[PDB]
């Protein structure tokens, strides 16, 4: 039975195939036919071209040996090559041109969600060319989904010479049977297919695919659309900031670019943010997703206090200061998302732009007490039972498993009732003591969000809610302000706590708001609807904070 | 006595003063004297400019205003501004021209440094302008060097309103006799004269000083030069990401832009560039600081194999992998300088560009091993002292004080001879067992290397030189290539063992080599020699690395 899937890079897991730039040249600049290619390879297993995928020498060394090859090629045919003729030139262009085969990469991911071992095993070049970064990007971006990457130039063999086979052999620990193989190059198949390994030749990726679907009998075309990728917590850097004395605020950090602040709500963790970390990254975005005070393996103080709007920004802002980022985009979600529209009205100087999801901004009513607010609005009368110290705490901690997997659900799957939650004297006295597993979840991240709350547990968290009248104290003096740094709303139709209508009037204090809309998506959007947040989130980064 | 200074900003800590370019514009369109003065301070407390620095407006609110109040004065002079009149224009402008007063910085630093408590109160505004970043950029280079920031725009007061001075004392918990306060506005100052502060009206900033000299009694005019700013420990971010099973790397993190890898030597820490990560995150770099594997916050596995250049650059590259980086820029000293130059050699499309300060590059010798070029360079017969595991370890971690203030010498400061180590048993035989300390470090520095040093030891740091033949056969691979990406080399006049002779031969392997070189600089680089170290890099990184 087969158990690993290896794939070549050039032609294969990327397109178009550097090594099909050669004949295309030949015909755009009227060569005699394989002219560029024969050049190429030149001296066969002696040659420069061999030298440099074995690593021997860089690829800036290579280049004048390709060109006096192409000079002695149209000498002995009798053509002349132009007079502007780079080498460097044509495989600038084309290796910048190549890109990701997505749905040869889908059925990998596929193979290995499905528990293949999975590899590239490519014939590849040392490149110390000064645009080097666009092929650097493009294999991070790649070999993160595999199991292992094979480079030619990095273990001093090539194919087809058979040592190489036997180094792959070697290290997925596979006997020849188990292994598929794919290839472009009909040659460097041969001695995989000699060993006795099955080999799909790669022409056109739909063929190759419905091969490679028969042989493993498993369903790769004409599959559901897949999942953004997530993060696996033990992959990750940890970062860690002491903000204070008592508090340190820890997150996740990836990639590279403008900083981009992901701000939790209730009850998450930076975790909540895993679709949206590995996107934002590879849309040039260096992400930093916090653990917000009282969470995870940031600090959690008991004093209520330490959680009103006007500490938890401080904090926020001290937290660049140590960083030393004078700016950062700041994208929030629920409590996190309030924090996110505070940060724009009282620190803009340190706001690139803002981003909420599902939490409106709503000026405070400086006429009406926080209390007398919710007497007048009934939808948060649930956040009545979050304010006695010490109730709510004793329910959500009770069985950490049960909580995650109450809270944690689509519109669709017998979403808590917010509504009689202090009639019926908690928030799981109609739910069920062994809830089933939500469609947006697997029981490993219900277990991570139970080993996180572990630590602390909840009274950091609702200590948030605490805050009403302080919050609604400091409010009251950004009364006159307006927000005019980039912002962008986006809702979700079925959150039925923060509900779409309730942002109707955010335009008379944010006159050049932004807005995204998602359908059937609850209260948890990040995992809910991975693909639509992150479609919207990256057309407005790229378009609006740079 | 006098123990708290306290800095206006404008004007005093930040040249030349934005309130300055009204006057200059007045004279530039040839307006009535003190016209756009007098529509600024229009309406006085309860005016505009007062509910801009209050915080109940932000600056991109305040703008109509002032224009407003500009044709209203216009009107009242009988004049008429010119058609293109912007105030938005000229705001921009002023702030973007204004820069740190330097010399009344290292007043501010000097105080502080002596006992002193510092503080900058300023009437200042809710920045919402598209350009804001220049500013918050110059306030997070400004407010790290004091123990208060007060702004007006925050605290909901302005100057010069007596509950300001009143806000001052009690933040400061300092009485007005213990307090200097420094300002370029007269009728700013009144209120801290009236409470009995010493008082400085500011307009030159060498006379503001020699007034401040003479309260304080402490020479500030005419000081030696400054040493760049340096780190503390518990204020950094520290970053943690894991390998591989058993191995974590730590880092410190400051800044933001292109991503530098400072990588220290034997038997250093992330702290050996304390005078460098300041000075290069403000010159627009992310930096990265490693706590090289084996060393401080790092993991120290016991093993020789561990240790060996291949192994080494292949975590440097599953580190810039996990965090999601497709390069950096790599810059080493000692044993990081031979890693770094490796990266180089092995990893080119991962490295932005190299430096090294005071490692040369010099290729294996394929006909001689190692033990043979050490027998024919006997600099290095120290080195046979470190490959017994076990020997040096005994030596060096029997008294960690001892060992880093042997160590750690300028060269006038009877640095160790590593001549005669072999025949005389140790690195320490000749050395006092109460070394005197450096100038290059305060007590609580060498400190900071004993209490890192207590958790691992001198094992896995030692291990780097046990790898001798390992490194040989691994470097052998790399002697057809040569080092095309952007490089620099650093020598240091004074190292008697990492020569500047020993790096003479770079330009046969490294052709386009930039080079830097320290007069009367030892072993010890970064803290011997950091306002030339730091000079150096800088320039380096803006013309060769972005
Ligand atoms: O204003 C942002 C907080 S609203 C809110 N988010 C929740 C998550 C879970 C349960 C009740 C909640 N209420
Ligand atoms: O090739 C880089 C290592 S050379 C070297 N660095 C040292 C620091 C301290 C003692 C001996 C040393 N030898």
Redesign the pocket.
């Known amino acids: 039975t087969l158990r690993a899937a290896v794939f070549d890079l050039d032609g294969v897991l990327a397109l178009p195939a550097v090594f099909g730039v050669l004949g295309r040249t030949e015909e755009a600049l009227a060569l005699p036919r394989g002219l560029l290619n024969d050049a190429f390879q030149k001296g066969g297993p002696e040659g420069a071209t061999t030298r440099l995928m074995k690593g021997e020498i860089t690829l800036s060394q290579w280049i004048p040996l390709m060109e006096e090859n192409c000079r002695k090629c149209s000498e002995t045919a009798k053509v002349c090559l132009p007079k502007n003729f780079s080498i460097k030139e044509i495989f600038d262009k084309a290796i910048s041109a190549r890109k990701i085969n997505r749905p040869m990469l889908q059925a990998a991911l596929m193979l290995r969600k499905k528990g293949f071992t999975t590899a590239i095993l490519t014939n590849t070049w040392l490149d110390d060319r000064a645009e080097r970064d666009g092929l650097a990007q493009l294999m991070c971006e790649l070999k993160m989904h595999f199991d292992f990457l094979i480079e030619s130039c990095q273990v001093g063999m090539v194919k087809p010479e058979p040592q190489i086979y036997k180094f792959l052999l070697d290290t997925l620990k596979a006997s020849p049977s188990e292994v598929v193989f794919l290839d472009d190059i009909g040659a460097n198949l041969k001695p995989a297919r000699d060993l006795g390994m099955v080999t799909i030749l790669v022409q056109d990726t739909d063929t190759a695919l419905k091969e490679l679907e028969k042989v493993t009998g498993i369903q790769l075309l004409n599959t559901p659309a897949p999942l953004p990728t997530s993060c696996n917590p033990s992959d990750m850097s940890h970062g860690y900031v002491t903000v204070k004395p008592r508090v340190r605020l820890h997150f996740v950090e990836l990639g590279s670019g403008p900083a981009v602040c992901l701000c939790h709500?209730?009850?998450e963790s930076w975790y909540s943010w895993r679709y949206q970390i590995p996107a934002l990254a590879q849309a040039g975005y260096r992400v930093l997703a916090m653990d917000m005070k009282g969470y995870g393996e940031s600090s959690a103080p008991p004093e209520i206090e330490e959680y009103c709007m006007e500490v938890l920004c401080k904090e926020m802002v001290t937290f660049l200061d140590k960083l030393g980022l004078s700016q950062a985009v700041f994208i929030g979600h629920?409590?996190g998302?309030?924090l996110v529209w505070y940060m724009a009205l009282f620190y803009p100087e340190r706001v690139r732009a803002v981003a909420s999801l599902n939490?409106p901004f709503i000026p405070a009513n400086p006429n009406m007490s926080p209390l007398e607010s919710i007497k007048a609005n009934p939808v948060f009368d649930?956040?009545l039972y979050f304010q006695e110290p010490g109730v709510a705490e004793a329910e959500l901690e009770q069985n950490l498993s049960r909580t995650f997997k109450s809270?944690f659900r689509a519109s669709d799957e017998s979403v808590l009732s917010?509504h009689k939650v202090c009639e019926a004297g908690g928030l799981f006295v109609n739910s069920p003591e062994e809830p089933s597993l939500s469609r947006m979840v697997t029981e490993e991240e219900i277990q991570f969000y139970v080993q996180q709350f572990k630590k602390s547990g909840f009274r950091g968290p609702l200590n948030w809610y605490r805050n009403m009248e302080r919050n609604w104290k400091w409010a009251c003096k950004s009364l006159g302000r307006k927000i005019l740094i980039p912002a962008l709303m986006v809702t979700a139709e079925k959150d039925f706590?923060?509900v779409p209508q309730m942002s109707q009037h955010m335009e008379d204090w944010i006159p050049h708001l932004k807005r995204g809309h998602i359908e059937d998506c609850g209260?948890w959007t990040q995992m809910d609807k991975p693909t639509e947040v992150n479609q919207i989130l990256i057309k407005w980064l790229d378009s609006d904070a740079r």
């Open positions: 709500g209730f009850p629920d409590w998302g309030m939490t649930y956040q809270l917010m706590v923060l209260h």
